Amino acid sequence: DKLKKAIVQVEHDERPARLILNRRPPAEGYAWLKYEDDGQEFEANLADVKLVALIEG
Amino acid sequence: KKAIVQVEHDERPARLILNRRPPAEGYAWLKYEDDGQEFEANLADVKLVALIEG
């Protein structure tokens, strides 16, 4: 019913990533994401990020 | 202290309900800030706005 932890799957620059929920935004409307293909964390303007899926961690 | 993921649907602010399982892949449950109504949305039609971190 209930997800205890969730992964917010997104896309940025054509690549699958997830939002890092526990890292503060660097600027208004931005967030840190982690790309799935290399595990690197980077800042993104949320206006340029598409939501893909919500699944259990 | 839970994270809050702020979005917009039909130009109205809302949040993703992070603790409720979606019924279908690429969909989710959202709650409008203005009336508290919970509803199903296709994430393709949902704009991400801000993160309040956990």
From Swiss-Prot, chain A:
Membrane-spanning segments: none
Family, similarity comment: Belongs to the ParB family.
Entry function: In conjunction with KorA, inhibits the transcription of the kilA, trfA and korAB operons. Is also involved in the negative control of the kilB operon.
The protein's name in its UniProt record: Transcriptional repressor protein KorB
